[PDB]
Design a protein around this ligand. Structure first.
Ligand code: HEC
Ligand code: HEC
Lengths: 126, 126
């Protein structure tokens, strides 16, 4: 699927755009501005779970470009921990959404959002 | 998630790019150029199933733009049938992939690809 590095960059940017949309659209629910519909949130968090696994294999060898910093590949073990923290927080979000637990969901949502920004601060060009 | 029509256009283009990647990457398998790994294809077709439901609600009212033709909204019942044929063919693809049946999978894959092009021919700017 990534014949040239520019195809990996197009894929990962598309996946990240879709993640941002499925994550950010829950902000009014977690802030009490819109009603919590447990079943609809469960379904949206499942879409976000699928999308959240997709960008990383499009940062494979040789796919420098876009707004990715070089240290993604030069400090690969450190990048992997930032990616892992995010993906661990998506597991917690899915557990909260599956349980219908709005306290857990809002806490997990804040942890996901902080881990998006913690990776950006180290690995995304400003 | 689509505060301005340009946000709906960015979302739907991103979803369609991800669909194209998850669909097209199976072409060598269905053409016998790469080995059929039933479990990996099942998992990829599940990603494609999730992605295939996403673009359509970002062609909502008022979201004219991109390479969408106007007749998507002026002939809405006709667009709906093109979208339905595609989504019906994704159900058949998921059934083949879940059953591990490569004859069914390649037949369903051709039907999906034809329905992508049948919508493009009527509804996507050349
Ligand atoms: C590193 C482990 C990351 C985590 C976790 C998340 N993001 Fe990210 N993001 C990352 C990089 C290296 C880039 C640049 C990719 C490129 O090659 O250009 C991005 C980019 C985005 C974008 C812009 C995509 C675009 O259209 O070009 C968005 C919208 C984005 N990131 C959002 C986002 C969200 C909402 C996250 C958590 C829910 C998230 N990112 C995590 C690296 C990483
Ligand atoms: C109508 C019912 C469609 C079906 C079924 C599929 N596609 Fe499509 N496609 C459609 C439109 C109206 C557009 C333009 C969207 C816009 O506003 O610009 C598209 C666009 C694409 C693109 C380009 C996305 C981009 O990056 O800008 C791709 C890669 C794409 N379409 C692929 C694709 C595939 C592989 C499909 C079936 C598996 C498929 N499309 C179905 C309308 C419709």
């Amino acid at each position: 699927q990534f014949a040239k590095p520019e195809d990996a960059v197009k894929y990962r940017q598309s996946a990240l755009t879709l993640m941002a949309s499925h994550f950010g659209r829950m902000t009014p629910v977690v802030k009490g501005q819109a009603p919590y519909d447990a079943a609809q949130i469960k379904a949206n968090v499942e879409v976000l779970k699928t999308l959240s696994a997709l960008p990383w294999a499009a940062f494979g060898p040789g796919t420098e470009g876009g707004d990715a910093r070089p240290e993604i590949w030069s400090d690969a073990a450190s990048f992997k921990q930032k990616q892992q923290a995010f993906q661990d927080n998506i597991v917690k979000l899915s557990a909260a959404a599956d349980a219908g637990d709005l306290d857990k969901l809002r806490a997990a949502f804040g942890d996901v959002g902080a881990s998006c920004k913690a990776c950006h601060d180290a690995y995304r060009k400003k």
